[PDB]
Specification:
The structure is cut from a larger assembly and holds 2 copies of chain A. The first copy, chain A, has 51 residues and is mainly alpha-helical. The first copy, chain A, contains 1 helix and no strands. The longest helix of chain A is centred in the N-terminal third of the chain and has 19 residues. Chain B: This is VP3.
Chain lengths: 51, 50
């Protein structure tokens, strides 16, 4: 049990830190939403009256 | 009325929007129910067979 047994955990922590500090410097820009539309209807059979 | 006549929970009737509730339709003069079918009993056997 030496400093070599901590290598995998060291890599786990290093990957977490790399992701975290690459998220900080990444530039973020808003995007335009162009998908709004009322196209989600439902079908079926009409309940026609009889008489 | 359609919900009352169809007591089975499996069939779901389309929900009405807020704008579709006050809309006006035309219904039948008298409803067809079991009483109408009861009076057809004398000739009902031929209908069942065919």
């Amino acid at each position: 049990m030496a400093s070599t047994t901590r290598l995998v955990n060291d890599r786990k922590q290093l990957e977490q830190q790399v992701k975290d500090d690459a998220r900080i410097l990444a530039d973020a820009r808003g995007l335009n939403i162009t998908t709004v539309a009322n196209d989600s209807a439902t079908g079926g059979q009409a309940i026609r009256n009889v008489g | 009325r359609i919900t009352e006549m169809v007591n089975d929970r499996r069939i779901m009737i389309q929900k009405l929007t807020l704008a579709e509730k006050p809309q006006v339709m035309r219904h039948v003069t008298t409803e067809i129910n079991n009483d109408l079918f009861f009076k057809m009993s004398p000739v009902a056997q031929l209908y069942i067979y065919h």
